[PDB]
Amino acid sequence: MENFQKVEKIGEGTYGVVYKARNKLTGEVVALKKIRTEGVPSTAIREISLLKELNHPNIVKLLDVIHTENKLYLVFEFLHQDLKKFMDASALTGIPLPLIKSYLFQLLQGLAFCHSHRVLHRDLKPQNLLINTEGAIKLADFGLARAFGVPVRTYTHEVVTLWYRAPEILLGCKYYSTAVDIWSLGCIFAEMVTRRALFPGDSEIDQLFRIFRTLGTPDEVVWPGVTSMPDYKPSFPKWARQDFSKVVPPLDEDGRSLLSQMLHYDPNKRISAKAALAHPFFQDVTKPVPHLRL
Numbered sequence: 001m002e003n004f005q006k007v008e009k010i011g012e013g014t015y016g017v018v019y020k021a022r023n024k025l026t027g028e029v030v031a032l033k034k035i036r037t038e039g040v041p042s043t044a045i046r047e048i049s050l051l052k053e054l055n056h057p058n059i060v061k062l063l064d065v066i067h068t069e070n071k072l073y074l075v076f077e078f079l080h081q082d083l084k085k086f087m088d089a090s091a092l093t094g095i096p097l098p099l100i101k102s103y104l105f106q107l108l109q110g111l112a113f114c115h116s117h118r119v120l121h122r123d124l125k126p127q128n129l130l131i132n133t134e135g136a137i138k139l140a141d142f143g144l145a146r147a148f149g150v151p152v153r154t155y156t157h158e159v160v161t162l163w164y165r166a167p168e169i170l171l172g173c174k175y176y177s178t179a180v181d182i183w184s185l186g187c188i189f190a191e192m193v194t195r196r197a198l199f200p201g202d203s204e205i206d207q208l209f210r211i212f213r214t215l216g217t218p219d220e221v222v223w224p225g226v227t228s229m230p231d232y233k234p235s236f237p238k239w240a241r242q243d244f245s246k247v248v249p250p251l252d253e254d255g256r257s258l259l260s261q262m263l264h265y266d267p268n269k270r271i272s273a274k275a276a277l278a279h280p281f282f283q284d285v286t287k288p289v290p291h292l293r294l
Contacts, residue, residue: 001066001073004032012156014123014141015148020078030063031079035072035148036155047147048074054117058110060130060140079130079138080294083188086131091195099288100192101281103129103137107185110139111273115178119143122176123150124184125164126191135289162207163187163200167218168267170208172230179267182276186262193251209237215263216241223265254281 004021007029011018016034023030045067052062061077083103087095095103107129114120121128122145131137153159162170166183169176190198199214201207212218217238218226226232244256251259258281261271271279 001068004030004075006032012154012158014150014154014160015144016155029078031060031076033074033076035074037070039070040067040072044072044147047143048072051119051143051147054114054119054143056110056113057136058106058138059114059142060138076140077138079132079140081131081292082127082140083129083131083137083192084126086290086292087126087192087195094195095192095290096288097193098286099135099290100189101285102135102287103131103192104185104189105277105282105285106137107139107188108273108276110142111178111181111185112277114139114142115181115273118178119146120176120178121145121181121184123160123164124181124188125161126188127161129188131290131292133289133292133294135287162202162204163197165207166267167208167211167265168229170204170211171226171232173267174230177267178272179270182262182270182273186259189255189259189262190248193248193255198247209239212236213239214242214247215265218265226265254279254283257281 003024005024007020007022009017010020010031013033016036019032021030021032022028045065048062048065052065055061060079062074063077064075066073066075111121119142121139121142123141124139128140129137130140151160164184164187166180169180187198199207199210201210216222217236220227227234244260248256248259258271258276258279262276264270
């Protein structure tokens, strides 16, 4: 809009270009996201308006929803870097465990908040986890997936990553529960620790099979009702579960215990954000300052 001066392009978003901009009135710097045409369905407008109310220290603040000239612009709080870039920058040495714990702890607080309001993300990934120089990490784009379905490709034709997608989604479950977000966060937790994506699938079946080879092909024992899901196939190969000691070294026993609970197949058995915050893994949690060189 005319009220904002585009400083620069932050990157390509799921729904449209993302710009760093300055409000010509408050002088504040923000993140402007254009959402991609008939006239914007009232459903999306109402949903997004509700998002302006779910405010939390670990949720990127939605400053304004600008709907003008039949176009949508979301104005968000600006943060200088995302977890994906931070992880890439810390490849040689890896994010210190204390910071990993702090980040997971804060992220769970964010999920617990949104989940308590029955709002889920559905597309959590390192790219939408933002951090600042003070040791904070925040979840970006929360609640947008429900307002605008998550596409296979972005407006730039970029392939939306499947790496953090929960198995119930891959198996065709039409109704998502807050458990999908815990799954994603579990995958992210494992990636920060090992410095390598847990399940880097490059297709839905490849993603599903990578999960199967690590956690074992799910059956009626560990996941009641799984064999009756839309995309389940009795012909799926049968792989045996691997031991977490092999999956995420050198994560200690508390970490492995919590990760296992965040990666449970049955969405109903998967640990909640609230319960995870009480896990012994966070007994010695602190808030370290990450070293960022902007």
